[PDB]
Each structure stands twice: as structure tokens, then as C-alpha cells.
DNA sequence: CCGACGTCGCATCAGC
DNA sequence: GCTGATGCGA
DNA sequence: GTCGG
């Protein structure tokens, strides 16, 4: 499937998805529309009718109708209408700021605050996360080339090892799947002193060192096991300075680490496929553990896992390299 | 017909 | 001030 | 909005 193969349809369904989530606050309709858009995005034929589309899992009667209207007229009346709607289009737009969700966007728009300009001159109505999201609005919508991601990985692994050479850190997500660009950086961290049965300062010392070398520039949230923040590569010579990027760091106990690495490497679809087989095979897999069921359906204790491969073994699937986990 | 549709860590609000 | 709820991003 | 028990 190629981009404008059914691109008009999948663009329409994505726009519908966003208004459901951000304006109508109907999260399940949001996910319904995205599921339809994903299945249609992978359909290897130009759709000729709604009835043709309805055969796909996730496409039902209402979306088939909408496809029929789009195919016949090149538009959807409802979508055209809500686009022109000042209140709804503004609510939907403001949720593009990190930290402004459907509820905050509604409240802002209720009181006349409708644009980034408006947000810019209303700082004291913004919490800390929202101010950062506003400050880096443009940067957070950029993608990260693998080359910068590699440079980012160099800094992270170097500084973590410098704090304590017994730390184990892994950059997961799309990067680990070998993608040529990434939306953010996902770091999983563990340390031999930290297990499930098991200082409450392990994550802090890593964050502090990355701030010290001026890699981490801002903090969205930070607790004992999860850091969410902002980072930036140092500027070259007198060159164009780099965009600020989103980075997460998760501290995970040693015995949960490789379940963590598997899960947070993804992809989405791959995690789903693998989880249901997974079930087929008499095992339950979440981000933390793999557990057996259980002649009744009663989960026994978590099984020992000391590498990704172990999990593949348990469910008798041949190991998949991260490179091959798009689904 | 009608409920499920992942779950959870952290920041902050609502209520006591 | 403490506890539970809500919003948010993932 | 779609699915399925
Ligand atoms: N809904 C989900 N279901 C199962 N696993 C999920 C998940 N969402 C996240 N994951 C676990 C697996 C998701 O792949 C992953 C990392 O989450 P991201 O950073 O949101 N997605 P990625 O890094 O692949 O793409 P990008 O370059 O745009 O950042 O974490
Ligand atoms: Mn990612
Ligand atoms: Mn991420
Ligand atoms: Na269908
Ligand atoms: Na937002």
C-alpha cells in the first residue's frame, strides 16, 4: 500500500478520530476510527465502495457510509462543518500542546484562549508541563533522524556508565527496531541492587548526571521509577542548534527488565500479536512478567526471564530480532 | 442488547 | 495536611 | 463506532 492509495479515506478517518478524542471526549470512538484507518492503510487495493471496506475488521456500517459519501463527493459534510467551527477547531488544535488534553483545551477555549499566541500571553494559567509543551511546540512535532538518535544514545550510555558501571541501560522503542527516524527516546534502566523483592535514588542519580552535562534540559515529571523530560544534543561549532527532543527514562527491577525491554521495544502491533499467542499457548504476558495459566485460568508465579529470548522460548516462537517486529 | 475497548506513574485537583 | 480522583501521556 | 457474547 502506497500513501495516497486510500490516503483520502485514512486522512478523513484520522481527522474524525481526533475530534472524537479532543472535542467529544469519546476515547473509544477515537480508537475505533484509528483502527479503521490502520486497517484501511494496509489494504493493498484502492477502495471502490464502502461495502468493499466494510469487509475489513474494524470497518462497520457507519464508516462504510462515510466512505461512500467521500468516494461520491470528495468530502464529508460533517467534517467540513466541524472544521469551520471556531470552538471545536480551537479545542482540537490546543491539544497539540503536550500537557493540554481534552479537558484543559475545553477550559481554555471556554474563556477565550484559542491560539498559541493566546497561550503565550496567558502563562500563569499554564501548569509546568503545559509551559514546557508550549515552549517546545514546534520541536516536539519534529521527528528525530537515526543519526541524531545514535548521538543521543552515545551520551546516555556514556553518562549512565559514568555514574555506576553496574547500571544496565537500553534505548528501546522504534530506535531499537532500527527505524530511520524516531518520535522520541525510550530508555530502560536497571541495576543489580534493584529487584522486585528488594536505593530509592537510582533513577535520580542518572537524571542528575544527564542534567549536569546539559543533555537533559527540562523535566515534565520525575518520580522514583519514571522520568519524563526534554533533551538536546550539544551545538556544533557555530551551526544550527538541534531541536529539543522528548526522552523517557524508566527504572525497572532486574527480574522484570527483559519483559520491559520486549514490551517497550514494540512495535504496537507486534506486542498485540505476541501477547495473544501468548494466550493461545497458556501464558499471560504484560510489560512486567510472563506467567502461566493455569488449568482453571489461575496465574501461577512469574517465570524466570534473563533475556528476551527466554520469553520467545516459553511460547515456542522463534526469536525475532527487533528489526523484524513491525508486526 | 449492551459492555469492552490495557494499564499505570506522576502532577495536580477535589474533598475532608 | 491527608487521601482518593482526575487528567495526561504513553 | 465496532465487535461479539
Ligand atoms: N499501546 C501499546 N500497546 C502495547 N505496547 C505499547 C503500547 N504503547 C506503547 N507500547 C510499548 C511499545 C510501543 O512501541 C513502545 C514505545 O512506545 P512509543 O515511544 O509510543 N512507540 P515507538 O517508540 O515504537 O514509536 P515512536 O518512534 O513514534 O516513538 O512501548
Ligand atoms: Mn518511542
Ligand atoms: Mn515513548
Ligand atoms: Na467490518
Ligand atoms: Na496535548
Amino acid at each position: 500500500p502506497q500513501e495516497t492509495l486510500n490516503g483520502g479515506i485514512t486522512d478523513m478517518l484520522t481527522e474524525l478520530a481526533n475530534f472524537e478524542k479532543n472535542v467529544s471526549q469519546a476515547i473509544h470512538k477515537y480508537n475505533a476510527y484509528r483502527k479503521a484507518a490502520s486497517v484501511i492503510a494496509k489494504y493493498p487495493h484502492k477502495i471502490k465502495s464502502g461495502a468493499e471496506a466494510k469487509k475489513l475488521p474494524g470497518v462497520g456500517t457507519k464508516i462504510a457510509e462515510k466512505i461512500d459519501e467521500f468516494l461520491a463527493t470528495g468530502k464529508l459534510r460533517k467534517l467540513e462543518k466541524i472544521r469551520q467551527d471556531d470552538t471545536s477547531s480551537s479545542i482540537n488544535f490546543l491539544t497539540r500542546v503536550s500537557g493540554i488534553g481534552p479537558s484543559a483545551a475545553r477550559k481554555f477555549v471556554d474563556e477565550g484562549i484559542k491560539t498559541l499566541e493566546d497561550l503565550r500571553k496567558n502563562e500563569d494559567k499554564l501548569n509546568h508541563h503545559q509551559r514546557i509543551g508550549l515552549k517546545y511546540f514546534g520541536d516536539f512535532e519534529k521527528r528525530i533522524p537515526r543519526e541524531e538518535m545514535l548521538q543521543m544514545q552515545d551520551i546516555v550510555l556514556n553518562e549512565v556508565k559514568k555514574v555506576d558501571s553496574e547500571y544496565i541501560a537500553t534505548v528501546c522503542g522504534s530506535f531499537r527496531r532500527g527505524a530511520e527516524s524516531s518520535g522520541d527516546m525510550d530508555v530502560l534502566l536497571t541495576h543489580p541492587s534493584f529487584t522486585s523483592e528488594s536505593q530509592p535514588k537510582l533513577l535520580h542519580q542518572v537524571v542528575e548526571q544527564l542534567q549536569k552535562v546539559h543533555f537533559i534540559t527540562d523535566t515534565l515529571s520525575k518520580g522514583e521509577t519514571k522520568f519524563m523530560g526534554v533533551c538536546q544534543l550539544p551545538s556544533k561549532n557555530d551551526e544550527k542548534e538541534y531541536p529539543h527532543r522528548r526522552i523517557d527514562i524508566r527504572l525497572i527491577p532486574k527480574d522484570q527488565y527483559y519483559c520491559g525491554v520486549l514490551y517497550f521495544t514494540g512495535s504496537d502491533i507486534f506486542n498485540k500479536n505476541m501477547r495473544a499467542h501468548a494466550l493461545e499457548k497458556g501464558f499471560t504476558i504484560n510489560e512486567y512478567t510472563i506467567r502461566p495459566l493455569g488449568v482453571t485460568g489461575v496465574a501461577g508465579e512469574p517465570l524466570p526471564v534473563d533475556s528476551e529470548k527466554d520469553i520467545f522460548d516459553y511460547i515456542q516462537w522463534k526469536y525475532r530480532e527487533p528489526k523484524d517486529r513491525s508486526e
Side-chain angles (χ1 to χ4, degrees), chain A residues 1 4-196 198 200-235 240-327:
Chain A
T4 89
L5 199 42
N6 295 284
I9 290 171
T10 54
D11 287 344
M12 166 184 80
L13 296 180
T14 299
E15 198 168 337
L16 288 174
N18 289 334
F19 281 107
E20 290 305 334
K21 178 188 192 304
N22 300 324
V23 179
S24 296
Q25 295 185 227
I27 192 63
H28 299 302
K29 290 201 194 179
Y30 160 81
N31 287 320
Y33 277 120
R34 291 181 66 238
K35 178 181 184 196
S38 299
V39 74
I40 286 174
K42 282 190 153 178
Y43 187 67
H45 308 269
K46 184 153 190 200
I47 291 160
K48 300 177 181 152
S49 75
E52 177 184 356
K54 191 161 186 316
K55 303 189 193 159
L56 304 180
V59 177
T61 289
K62 299 292 280 296
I63 282 172
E65 290 186 17
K66 285 181 172 62
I67 284 165
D68 283 343
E69 179 180 349
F70 178 84
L71 285 182
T73 77
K75 343 164 212 181
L76 266 193
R77 292 201 78 95
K78 285 184 170 75
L79 195 38
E80 299 291 285
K81 192 56 177 182
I82 198 163
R83 269 187 207 149
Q84 93 172 60
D85 191 281
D86 186 76
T87 285
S88 298
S89 65
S90 295
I91 286 170
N92 185 62
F93 166 71
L94 289 184
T95 63
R96 281 170 61 195
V97 180
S98 182
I100 301 183
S103 179
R106 178 93 81 209
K107 275 170 211 197
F108 286 138
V109 170
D110 281 344
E111 62 185 308
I113 295 164
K114 290 177 191 151
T115 62
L116 293 180
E117 296 80 312
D118 290 337
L119 289 180
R120 278 197 280 117
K121 65 180 206 186
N122 282 281
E123 173 167 71
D124 50 41
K125 293 171 182 290
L126 261 57
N127 62 32
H128 182 73
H129 186 144
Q130 291 167 344
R131 288 169 194 192
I132 298 310
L134 175 56
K135 178 179 186 162
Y136 302 123
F137 184 85
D139 281 354
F140 288 178
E141 284 189 346
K142 292 202 229 278
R143 296 186 62 78
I144 318 170
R146 177 161 197 95
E147 167 59 16
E148 293 177 32
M149 286 291 287
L150 290 163
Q151 291 178 52
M152 286 159 73
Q153 179 181 232
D154 291 343
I155 293 179
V156 172
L157 301 180
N158 181 67
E159 298 300 333
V160 162
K161 183 173 188 178
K162 171 160 13 160
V163 179
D164 189 332
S165 60
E166 292 182 68
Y167 280 116
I168 298 162
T170 311
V171 188
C172 302
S174 52
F175 177 72
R176 185 157 180 270
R177 295 199 313 273
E180 204 50 60
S181 74
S182 290
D184 56 23
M185 172 172 261
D186 309 291
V187 187
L188 271 58
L189 185 74
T190 192
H191 188 280
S193 59
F194 182 26
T195 62
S196 298
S198 165
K201 293 182 69 63
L202 281 178
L203 179 56
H204 173 91
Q205 299 177 338
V206 167
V207 173
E208 177 173 18
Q209 177 65 20
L210 287 169
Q211 292 167 317
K212 269 206 207 144
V213 300
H214 304 107
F215 178 66
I216 286 172
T217 64
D218 305 82
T219 303
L220 295 172
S221 57
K222 180 183 173 293
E224 305 192 15
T225 56
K226 192 177 87 180
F227 173 81
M228 294 175 64
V230 182
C231 60
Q232 182 186 38
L233 290 178
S235 203
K240 246 279 232 56
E241 65 180 63
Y242 286 100
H244 292 69
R245 313 297 202 174
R246 278 277 293 105
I247 181 177
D248 286 8
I249 307 170
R250 314 187 163 247
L251 180 79
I252 298 173
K254 185 70 180 299
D255 47 302
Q256 288 185 8
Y257 190 63
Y258 295 104
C259 281
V261 171
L262 178 73
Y263 182 80
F264 288 114
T265 292
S267 76
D268 270 353
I269 293 137
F270 171 80
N271 279 348
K272 282 136 161 56
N273 289 334
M274 182 165 180
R275 137 157 63 175
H277 167 219
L279 231 86
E280 144 176 32
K281 265 274 183 198
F283 296 93
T284 172
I285 300 179
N286 53 36
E287 73 176 279
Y288 306 100
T289 56
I290 179 179
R291 295 164 295 151
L293 322 147
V295 161
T296 295
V298 172
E301 293 304 3
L303 302 171
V305 186
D306 298 8
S307 70
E308 284 195 307
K309 152 225 142 170
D310 287 6
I311 302 163
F312 288 87
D313 288 3
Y314 279 133
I315 64 170
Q316 296 180 338
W317 251 4
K318 138 176 181 278
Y319 181 87
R320 219 92 61 77
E321 303 293 344
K323 160 182 309 214
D324 305 320
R325 303 174 189 176
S326 45
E327 61 179 57

